[PDB]
């Protein structure tokens, strides 16, 4: 008898089979974001990388193309978040850790640059960037608070410095945007 719409349906989509600790990522991300979204129902899926979006010179995929791929996926999900071990970029950036529709349904994170031998560090990074991109899907922009997960990170240093949590302001924004 769960109140209709009280369970956000998240789809975590693995774009390849080389994502380290995928199951831990999904478990941790699910637990983590539940603080903000409530108990979330996660579903794991696969998707094919869009080869047209692969830059052979860069050895990277255009993140937006992965979002388009996610957008094209069947299923009723409130959010579809992709993970890949392939490196991503966006036009005019050397790389991105991820990208999201802002706001919108899809986000994608690459673990390619988040890899670390330390599993806890790695998992925290992936959870952070998934949470960051998830924030964007809820219309959150970048947060000036460098400890906020919505802080824009363009390096590991920056990912590692910020918390996986939304700051006071972003939590309020996110709940405000969730109210809808």
CB nearer Zn ion, residue 76 or residue 171: 171
- Min. distance of Cβ 64 from Zn ion in angstroms? 13
Residue 148 marked ligand-binding: yes
Question: Residue 49 is encoded by which pair of tokens?
Answer: 């990388």
> Which residues here bind Zn ion, judged by CB under 5 A?
143, 145, 148, 150, 167, 170
Residue 143 marked ligand-binding: yes
- Min. distance of Cβ 56 from Zn ion in angstroms? 26
CB nearer Zn ion, residue 37 or residue 150: 150
* Rounded-to-integer distance, Cα 94 and Cα 88, Å: 9
- Min. distance of Cβ 146 from Zn ion in angstroms? 10
Residue with structure tokens 């791929």? 69
- Min. distance of Cβ 75 from Zn ion in angstroms? 25
CB nearer Zn ion, residue 24 or residue 171: 171
Residue 52 marked ligand-binding: no
Per the CB < 8 A criterion, the answer to whether 152 and 142 are in contact is yes
Nearest Cα neighbor of 28 from 164, 132, 170 is: 164
Helix (H, G, I), strand (E, B) or coil at 89: strand
Residue 102 marked ligand-binding: no
Q: How many residues does the chain have?
A: 180
CB nearer Zn ion, residue 19 or residue 149: 149
Residue 167 marked ligand-binding: yes
Per the CB < 8 A criterion, the answer to whether 92 and 55 are in contact is no
Q: Is 133 a catalytic residue?
A: yes
Catalytic residue among 31, 133, 158, 172: 133
* Rounded-to-integer distance, Cα 11 and Cα 125, Å: 19
What residues have CB less than 8 Å from 177, skipping those under 6 apart? 103, 138, 139, 140
Binding site as annotated, residues for Zn(2+): 132, 136, 142-143, 148, 167, 170
User: Active-site residue numbers?
Assistant: 133
Binding site as annotated, residues: 132, 136, 142-143, 148, 167, 170
């Amino acid at each position: 008898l769960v109140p209709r719409g009280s369970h956000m349906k998240l789809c975590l989509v693995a774009f390849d089979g080389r994502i380290p600790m995928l199951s831990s990522i999904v478990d941790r991300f699910e637990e983590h974001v539940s603080e903000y979204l409530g108990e979330v129902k996660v579903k794991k899926k696969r998707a094919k990388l869009p080869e047209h979006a692969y830059s052979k010179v860069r050895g990277q995929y255009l993140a937006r193309a992965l979002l388009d791929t996610l957008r094209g996926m069947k299923g009723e999900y409130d959010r579809v978040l992709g993970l890949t071990s392939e490196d991503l970029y966006a036009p005019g950036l050397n790389f991105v850790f991820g990208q999201a529709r802002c706001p919108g349904r899809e986000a994608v994170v690459s673990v390619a640059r988040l890899l670390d031998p330390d599993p806890e560090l790695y998992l925290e990074r992936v959870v952070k960037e998934l949470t960051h991109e998830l924030g964007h899907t809820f219309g959150l922009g970048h947060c000036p608070d460098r400890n906020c997960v919505m802080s824009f990170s363009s390096s590991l240093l920056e990912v590692d410095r910020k918390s996986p949590n939304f700051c006071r302001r972003c939590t309020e924004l996110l709940q405000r945007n969730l109210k809808r």
